[PDB]
Symmetry: C6
Amino acid sequence: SESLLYGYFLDSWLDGTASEELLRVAVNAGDLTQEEADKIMSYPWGAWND
Amino acid sequence: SESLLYGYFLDSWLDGTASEELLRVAVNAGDLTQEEADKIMSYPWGAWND
Amino acid sequence: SESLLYGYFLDSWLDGTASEELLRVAVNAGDLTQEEADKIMSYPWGAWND
Amino acid sequence: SESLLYGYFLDSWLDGTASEELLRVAVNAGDLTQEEADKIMSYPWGAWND
Amino acid sequence: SESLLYGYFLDSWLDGTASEELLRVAVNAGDLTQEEADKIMSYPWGAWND
Amino acid sequence: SESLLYGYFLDSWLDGTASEELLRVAVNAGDLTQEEADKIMSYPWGAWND
C-alpha cells in the first residue's frame, strides 16, 4: 500500500504546483517511494489547470 | 472496497477538472480499477459547475 | 455504517451543488444506498447558501 | 465516541452556515445524536466570522 | 493520543480565527482536553497570517 | 510511523506559511518529532508559491 502522502503529492503534480525535484526530495525524505514518484510523473503535469 | 483515491478522482470528474484520459492514466497507474473509472464516467461530467 | 462518500454527497446537497438526479446516479453506482439518498434529501437543499 | 459528521456539523455552526433547525434535521437523520447537537449549540455561533 | 478535533482547533488558533474562550468551550465540551488547550496556546496565535 | 500532523506541518512549510520557529514549537509540543522537523526543513520552503 502507498505512502500516506501519495494522494497529497499526486494532487500537487496534477494542480501544477509540484516539480520533478520536489518529488525527489520526498523520495529521499521517505515520504514517497521511488516507484510512487515515477508513477506520479506518469500523469500529465498540471492536468487540473488544462 | 474502493481504491483510496476513488473519491478524489470522482470529485475531479464532477467538478469538471478531470478528463477521460486522466482516469485511464489512473487505471494504468493502479490508483483506480477499470470498473471504478467506468463508474465515475457514469456520472454527469462537470455536474458541480452546472 | 454509512457509505464512504455519504458526507461528501451530503455536503454537495447542503452547498447547493448536487441535484436529485446526481444522488440517484450515486445510488445506482453503489456509492450511496437508497436509504442514504432519501436521508440526504430530507435536508434543506442549498442550506449553506441560505 | 462521536458521530462521523460531528466535526463537520460543528464547523458549520462555528463558520455561521448552520442553523438550529439544520442540526435537528441531522439529529433526526441520525447523523448526530441529540447530545451532540446540544454540545455544538454550546459554542458561539459564527465564531470564525467574529 | 489526542482528541479527534485537536488538529482542527490547532489550525483555527494558527490561522487566527479561534480565541482563548473558544478553546475553553471545547475543553468543557470534551472536544479537547485541558492539556491540549494549553498546548495549542503555546503556539503563536495567528501564525499563518504573519 | 509519523505524527498525525506531519502532513499538515509539511504543507505549511511548502505553502510558505510556517517558519523554523513554528516547527520547533511543534517539536516541543510533541506534535512533531525532532527528526520530522528536520525532514520538513529539507524541503524547499514555500515551494508551492514558486
